[PDB]
Amino acid sequence: LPVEYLQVPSASMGRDIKVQFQGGGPHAVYLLDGLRAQDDYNGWDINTPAFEEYYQSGLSVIMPVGGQSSFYTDWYQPSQSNGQNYTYKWETFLTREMPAWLQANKGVSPTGNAAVGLSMSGGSALILAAYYPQQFPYAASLSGFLNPSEGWWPTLIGLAMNDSGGYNANSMWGPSSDPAWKRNDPMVQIPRLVANNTRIWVYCGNNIPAKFLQGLTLRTNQTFRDTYAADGGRNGVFNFPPNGTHSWPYWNEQLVAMKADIQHVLNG
Incomplete structure (x- = not known):
């Protein structure tokens, strides 16, 4: 019932990962952070009443802390030019290390949870559900990058990572020809989301190099929707309100709006 700050060892990253945690039930919402x-704190707790909004929801809330520009993925190597001295292994942490710890210590089930991501982690949430459907029957992407391997996206993602911490996308998924780019591309993995009957919730809202990027993000999100439908997807909620914005107030509004949806999937 009270909010806790946990030190959860990551063998794969060779350090302790801080996790903000609110109990409330055996199944949990994993709230993933932005770029x-x-x-110190997960962006959901910094900017929103997420914990309060899900208090007594019958769901636990998990906010991992850290991982700037990590895309919550397992990297090939430490990011070279910014002096990172370990390899990001956030997929291993989120799918093995952390749920094991939460199960042993708190009784949180490793299966039957929801992954909710925004910006950077919007794609991550869908990828986690794509490859770990037992752990995540539910996944939400708010203003996510849903076709990272395609067109200009590897270039833009590389620039974004440089402009947030000096991280280098080549250390993460290799050059854009590397199979890791398509492996971690939600668009490309839509057949998995359909085959798994994943419940997905996709949101996207709407100085001129930003006009381009804002437009590209929404249009890519629209192609994702169409391709999901075309591939036989029938378990999706697609929210593209024209006045929607790419900001914590609207990301929080989406988190609140999906609560009933998550409750019915995870606890129904």
């Missing part, structure tokens, strides 16, 4: 995930 500039900080090392």
